[PDB]
Amino acid sequence: ARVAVLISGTGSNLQALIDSTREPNSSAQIDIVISNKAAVAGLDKAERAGIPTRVINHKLYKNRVEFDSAIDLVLEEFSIDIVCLAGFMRILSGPFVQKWNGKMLNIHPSLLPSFKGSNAHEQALETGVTVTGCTVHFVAEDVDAGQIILQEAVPVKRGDTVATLSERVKLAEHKIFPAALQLVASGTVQLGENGKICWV
Ligand SMILES: Nc1nc2[nH]c(CCCCc3csc(C(=O)N[C@@H](CCC(=O)O)C(=O)O)c3)cc2c(=O)[nH]1
Ligand SMILES: NCC(=O)N[C@@H]1O[C@H](COP(=O)([O-])[O-])[C@@H](O)[C@H]1O
């Protein structure tokens, strides 16, 4: 299966996917990395790995639908089967999500359905949980509400900050995102017609 990875930043999840998809038994190959932001470290990681990159600046488009259409053009250019959102921080439009239904995965740094949104660690810390974690899910139109593929729990330590908690949770992200991508690329897991996850 041919994979696009979309990023907005550092790209540690991208790097874990590059490493995993290059193992001999990988059912996935990364053929393009797309960033909505220029000069982010994730682009360096892609280029060093010899993977093509495109920057599609969302600021340059009239609305969400036109931005998504620009992304979609590149996905078609590279005959992409599966999209991974790896630190990509834009909400996607309904028609784009619908087109890629069952083919697009996101990593989120909480145990969904807790702490949906763009500041999950801040929420976890404010709430005072002692266990958080991360989630890989299929992307649905409602943000962070799509069908869950894998999750991993991560303890919150007393005195944690966003810096220390995000560091600990990223170690788990780098485990489950490669595992989830392999499950979907191998056809082991799919989004069922009834909308629920199907292990074949
Ligand atoms: N339809 C849909 N789009 C998705 N995009 C992502 C990817 C993960 C999204 C996380 C996220 C949660 S809220 C937010 C946000 O408000 N973004 C802003 C801009 C944020 C920024 O640029 O810094 C926006 O899009 O206007 C970003 C996941 C996901 C999803 O499940 N469904
Ligand atoms: N999807 C919402 C969200 O908060 N995503 C989070 O952004 C970070 C990106 O790090 P990276 O650029 O090093 O992969 C990751 O922790 C990811 O779970």
Report the 3 state secondary structure along 152-180: EEEECCCCCCHHHHHHHHHHHHHHHHHHH
Degrees, nearest 5: CA angle 126-127-128: 95
> Rounded to an integer, what distance in angstroms lies between the CA atom of residue 196 and that of residue 138?
10
Per-domain residue ranges of the chain: 1-200
**What single-letter DSSP state applies at residue 92?**
P
Contacts of 107 (CB under 8 A, 6+ apart): 13, 84, 85, 86, 87, 134, 135, 136, 173, 176, 177
User: Using CA atoms, how far apart are residues 121 and 99, in angstroms rounded to an integer?
Assistant: 30
Give the C-alpha separation, 159 to 45, whole Å: 32
- 91 in a labelled binding site: yes
Location of structure tokens 């990988």: 26
Q: In whole angstroms, give the CA distance from residue 4 to residue 17.
A: 11
> Is residue 35 in contact with ligand 2, taking CB distance under 6 Å?
no
DSSP alpha helices (H): ranges in 22-119? 41-48, 64-77, 94-99
Active site residues per annotation: 108
CATH number of 1-200: 3.40.50.170
Residue to substitute in 61, 65, 91 for testing ligand 1 pocket (most ligand atoms within 8 angstroms of CB)? 91
State this model's resolution in angstroms.
1.6
Measured distance CA(132)–CA(86) in Å, rounded: 19
Residues 6+ apart with CB under 8 A from 185: 1, 3, 26, 27, 28, 81, 82
Give the Å distances, CA to CA, from 153 to 3, 121, 162, 165: 26, 13, 16, 12
Q: Tell me the residue type at 92.
A: L
3-state SS class at 69: helix
In whole angstroms, what is the distance from residue 77 CA to residue 95 CA? Answer: 19
Rounded to whole angstroms, how far apart are CA atoms 51 and 47?
A: 5
The number of the ligand nearest the C-alpha atom of 85 reads: 1
Q: What are the C-alpha distances in Å from 94 to residues 61, 97, 142, 152?
A: 17, 5, 9, 28
From 176, 161, 162, 167, select the one nearest 111 (Cα to Cα). Answer: 176
Distances (CA, A) of 87 to 33, 40, 91, 127, 187: 12, 11, 12, 23, 24
Q: How was this structure determined?
A: X-ray
No. of helices (H) and no. of strands (E), the chain: 6, 9
CB 82 within 8 A of CB 28: yes
Angle at 103 between CA 98 and CA 104, to 5 degrees: 80
What distance in Å separates the CA atoms of residue 110 and residue 144, rounded to the nearest whole number?
10
Non-local (6+) Cβ contacts of 145 within 8 A are: 112, 113, 116
Helix axes 12-21, 162-185, angle to 10 degrees: 30
Contact 148, 112 (CB under 8 A): yes
**Phi, psi values for residue 37, rounded to 5°:** -135, 135
